[PDB]
Amino acid sequence: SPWFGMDIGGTLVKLSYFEPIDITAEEEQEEVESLKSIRKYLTSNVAYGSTGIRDVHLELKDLTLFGRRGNLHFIRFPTQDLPTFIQMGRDKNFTVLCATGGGAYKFEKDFRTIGNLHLHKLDELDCLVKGLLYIDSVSFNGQAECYYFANASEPERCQKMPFNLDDPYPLLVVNIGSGVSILAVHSKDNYKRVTGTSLGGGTFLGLCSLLTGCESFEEALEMASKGDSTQADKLVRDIYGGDYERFGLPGWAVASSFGNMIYKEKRESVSKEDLARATLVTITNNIGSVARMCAVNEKINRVVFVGNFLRVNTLSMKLLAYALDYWSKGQLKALFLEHEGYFGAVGALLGLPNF
Amino acid sequence: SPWFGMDIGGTLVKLSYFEPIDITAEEEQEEVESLKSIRKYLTSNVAYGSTGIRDVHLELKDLTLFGRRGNLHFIRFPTQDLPTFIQMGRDKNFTVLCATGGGAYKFEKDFRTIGNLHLHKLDELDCLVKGLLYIDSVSFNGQAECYYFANASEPERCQKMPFNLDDPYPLLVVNIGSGVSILAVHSKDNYKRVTGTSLGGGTFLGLCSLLTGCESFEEALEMASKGDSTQADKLVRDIYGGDYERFGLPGWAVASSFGNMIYKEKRESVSKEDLARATLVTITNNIGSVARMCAVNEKINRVVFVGNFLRVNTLSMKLLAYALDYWSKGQLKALFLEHEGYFGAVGALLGLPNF
Numbered sequence: 001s002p003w004f005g006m007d008i009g010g011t012l013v014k015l016s017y018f019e020p021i022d023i024t025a026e027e028e029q030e031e032v033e034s035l036k037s038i039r040k041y042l043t044s045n046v047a048y049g050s051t052g053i054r055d056v057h058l059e060l061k062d063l064t065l066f067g068r069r070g071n072l073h074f075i076r077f078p079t080q081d082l083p084t085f086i087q088m089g090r091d092k093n094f095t096v097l098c099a100t101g102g103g104a105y106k107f108e109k110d111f112r113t114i115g116n117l118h119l120h121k122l123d124e125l126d127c128l129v130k131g132l133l134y135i136d137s138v139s140f141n142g143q144a145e146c147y148y149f150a151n152a153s154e155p156e157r158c159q160k161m162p163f164n165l166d167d168p169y170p171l172l173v174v175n176i177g178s179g180v181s182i183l184a185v186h187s188k189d190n191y192k193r194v195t196g197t198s199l200g201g202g203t204f205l206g207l208c209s210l211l212t213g214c215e216s217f218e219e220a221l222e223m224a225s226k227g228d229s230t231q232a233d234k235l236v237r238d239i240y241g242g243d244y245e246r247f248g249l250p251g252w253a254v255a256s257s258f259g260n261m262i263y264k265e266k267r268e269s270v271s272k273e274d275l276a277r278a279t280l281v282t283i284t285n286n287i288g289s290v291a292r293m294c295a296v297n298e299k300i301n302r303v304v305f306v307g308n309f310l311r312v313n314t315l316s317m318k319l320l321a322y323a324l325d326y327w328s329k330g331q332l333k334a335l336f337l338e339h340e341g342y343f344g345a346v347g348a349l350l351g352l353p354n355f
Numbered sequence: 356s357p358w359f360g361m362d363i364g365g366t367l368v369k370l371s372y373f374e375p376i377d378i379t380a381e382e383e384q385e386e387v388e389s390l391k392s393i394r395k396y397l398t399s400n401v402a403y404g405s406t407g408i409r410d411v412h413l414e415l416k417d418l419t420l421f422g423r424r425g426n427l428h429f430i431r432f433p434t435q436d437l438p439t440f441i442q443m444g445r446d447k448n449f450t451v452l453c454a455t456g457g458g459a460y461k462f463e464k465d466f467r468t469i470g471n472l473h474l475h476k477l478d479e480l481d482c483l484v485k486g487l488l489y490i491d492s493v494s495f496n497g498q499a500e501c502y503y504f505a506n507a508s509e510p511e512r513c514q515k516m517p518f519n520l521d522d523p524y525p526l527l528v529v530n531i532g533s534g535v536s537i538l539a540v541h542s543k544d545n546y547k548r549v550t551g552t553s554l555g556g557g558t559f560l561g562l563c564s565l566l567t568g569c570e571s572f573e574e575a576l577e578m579a580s581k582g583d584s585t586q587a588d589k590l591v592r593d594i595y596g597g598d599y600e601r602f603g604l605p606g607w608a609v610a611s612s613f614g615n616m617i618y619k620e621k622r623e624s625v626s627k628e629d630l631a632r633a634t635l636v637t638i639t640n641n642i643g644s645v646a647r648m649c650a651v652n653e654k655i656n657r658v659v660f661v662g663n664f665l666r667v668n669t670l671s672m673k674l675l676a677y678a679l680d681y682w683s684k685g686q687l688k689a690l691f692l693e694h695e696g697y698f699g700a701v702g703a704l705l706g707l708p709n710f
């Protein structure tokens with residue numbers, strides 16, 4: 001069987017695929033044409049159909065896994081297109097599938113329409129933590145998997161810098177997918193889901209599409225990059241005329257997200273780009289604030305953000321880096337991971353020896 | 356001088372007015388015609404101009420204050436109309452004004468266009484806490500000022516019931532105005548602002564107006580009462596197919612607010628009423644969740660909600676009552692106050708002896 005791990009989320013399916021590179025002459029002969037066709041198809045294309053994408057820059061090369069050397073590939077496509085994925089599988093025969101995410105339960109019966117396919121549903125928490133610790137342990141092709149934005153306060157100095165996670169505990173993991181799950185990791189076998197919030201990546205994309213008519217996550221980010229969120233938001237200075245220094249609230253802090261939109265004349269003058277940026281800022285600040293409160297309650301100072309809300313989203317990453325440092329008075333550090341969307345899929349793959 | 360307290364917020368001005376009812380024959384003679392005209396105008400009208408409203412049902416009758424007996428009146432109007440209020444004052448002469456809220460600073464120079472008027476800006480935190488403790492201490496005309504929703508889990512049993520605050524400490528106060536301020540009250544002289552969130556009443560009204568075209572807070576609530584938030588929100592059951600009982604998440608919990616709006620066909624079928632209800636649910640759940648995290652961090656189990664976001668808003672109150680009890684496993688109790696919008700204005704009035 002080909003070595004796969006799958007994380008079927010509410011929005012995106014993430015797939016990790018181990019491509020063996022130590023195939024001998026005898027192993028190559030004893031290989032089914034269908035398996036050769038799949039390995040060729042996956043390694044020769046970067047786009048799969050109309051909506052599948054291989055994130056080639058994330059590939060881990062010459063990894064040793066389960067006693068074999070190979071390349072670890074990272075592939076994503078919309079959960080809405082999983083029927084196409086399953087129909088491709090039924091055309092080409094199939095295979096033991098380790099799968100996590102809500103879709104491993106929701107679509108269990110659909111996966112079993114592939115004859116003799118064994119689906120093993122693995123716990124999302126075990127998969128995320130195991131995959132995160134594994135990828136950081138093997139490194140990103142010799143580079144750090146984990147990074148932070150140094151001097152996030154000053155833009156002419158703010159820069160991505162590596163962060164060591166050799167002793168990773170304790171760790172607060174903020175998984176920003178459709179919603180937000182917050183995990184406290186105390187050891188490799190002691191971790192829990194602290195809480196969550198429903199204001200996550202699906203809120204950003206859903207509200208953005210409603211307010212602006214954007215048709216993709218990427219377009220929503222492009223609009224936001226051009227907008228001014230203060231056209232929609234009411235700031236501390238709009239209410240006080242300046243700072244509220246009795247409680248250390250700077251004049252630029254947002255007092256009411258979309259609060260200026262209670263005035264009809266302001267709703268008629270705001271641009272789509274402004275509304276996209278205000279949506280991004282609102283969601284990101286709320287995630288950071290909830291992360292801060294959980295970190296204080298859990299007595300954890302390292303807060304790592306994962307998921308795909310932050311994919312190609314430097315605005316939200318830098319906002320989290322600056323805001324978490326500022327509002328924590330420097331007590332909390334925002335951390336990011338290069339493979340932030342794929343840890344559940346990797347952890348599922350890592351469960352394969354159990355079956 | 357007439358006895359006023361004013362809380363000038365970002366959205367609404369709240370005014371508490373003490374109408375003396377023990378006026379003697381000699382005091383009545385030594386009364387200026389302008390003062391008689393104001394007292395008559397305020398006590399003979401329930402609507403002031405086009406946007407001012409006296410909340411007659413909140414009136415405290417036969418209150419003893421500063422050695423006099425009188426009635427305490429509660430009046431509100433939009434901050435946008437404060438220029439009209441100030442221009443009425445300049446027409447009729449004026450007076451020592453105790454004022455709080457952001458507008459006491461922002462509009463200080465405007466108040467001083469009234470000749471010889473002395474404006475004393477009072478701390479918003481001292482005013483809110485002092486006014487809250489005062490009103491509960493004197494009672495709501497013999498009835499409890501504080502109430503909760505008993506058996507908030509079962510709708511055929513859920514009912515408003517009084518709550519005693521004779522020993523009020525400690526207390527977590529959640530002030531839902533344009534944004535949200537969260538206060539920890541440990542004694543009558545030991546209290547602090549824990550944190551806040553920008554997702555408050557102005558977010559509900561601003562987003563609602565953008566999404567539905569509603570032109571008032573009341574219309575936004577009327578729309579929400581007719582909507583189904585699950586048409587816009589993605590629930591736990593939409594992602595898992597049912598409950599996620601590994602982490603005790605029921606299938607009806609919202610996993611992604613507006614998360615179903617990432618699909619164009621669902622954006623085209625959702626009603627304004629559905630979007631209004633999803634906006635209300637999103638904002639209310641986020642406020643409750645942040646209140647819960649702060650209560651856990653502060654080790655306080657009594658959480659009282661104030662502001663005007665909850666005025667004529669039973670939906671949000673019952674949602675807070677049910678959700679705070681459910682997600683806290685019954686460890687936190689949601690409390691409400693009849694005079695929830697006016698405590699800052701009362702506390703400002705109570706500062707009058709200092710001047």
Ligand SMILES: Nc1ncnc2c1ncn2[C@@H]1O[C@H](COP(=O)(O)OP(=O)(O)NP(=O)(O)O)[C@@H](O)[C@H]1O
Pocket residue numbers: 008009010011012013101102176177178179200201202203204205217306307308309310311341594610
């Ligand atoms: N190509 C994309 N399509 C859709 N959303 C994207 C895309 N790229 C980034 N995103 C963002 O990533 C979020 C989904 O992240 P992801 O971690 O894959 O969630 P999920 O696993 O599908 N959902 P969940 O069931 O809650 O764990 C979306 O809500 C968007 O904000």
Ligand SMILES: Nc1ncnc2c1ncn2[C@@H]1O[C@H](COP(=O)(O)OP(=O)(O)NP(=O)(O)O)[C@@H](O)[C@H]1O
Pocket residue numbers: 239255363364365366367368456457531532533534555556557558559560572661662663664665666696
């Ligand atoms: N008649 C109304 N007009 C506008 N908003 C209303 C009205 N009635 C209730 N509300 C709600 O009440 C919220 C404002 O509550 P309020 O406590 O008066 O805030 P504020 O003091 O004006 N703002 P802040 O400066 O943040 O303290 C609005 O955001 C609405 O959600």
Ligand SMILES: O=C(Cc1ccc(C2CC2)cc1F)N1CCN(c2nc3ncc(F)cc3o2)CC1
Pocket residue numbers: 236239249253254255256284285286287288289290292319320323324327328457534535536550551552553
């Ligand atoms: O109180 C507030 C908002 C607010 C609400 C109402 C008013 C009233 C007019 C008086 C004023 C205000 F300023 N804020 C402080 C906490 N906050 C925050 N904490 C974070 N932690 C990590 C992050 F990544 C991001 C973060 O944002 C957001 C701003």
Ligand SMILES: O=C(Cc1ccc(C2CC2)cc1F)N1CCN(c2nc3ncc(F)cc3o2)CC1
Pocket residue numbers: 102179180181195196197198591594604608609610611639640641642643644645647674675678679682683
């Ligand atoms: O984790 C979540 C939301 C969530 C996010 C992502 C997922 C992923 C698919 C896996 C599932 C989820 F369910 N929730 C628990 C905490 N929560 C809450 N706590 C409250 N406290 C007091 C209140 F008044 C209201 C409250 O709401 C909101 C729901």
Ligand SMILES: [Mg+2]
Pocket residue numbers: 009010101177178
């Ligand atoms: Mg996910």
Ligand SMILES: [Mg+2]
Pocket residue numbers: 364365456532533
């Ligand atoms: Mg206020």
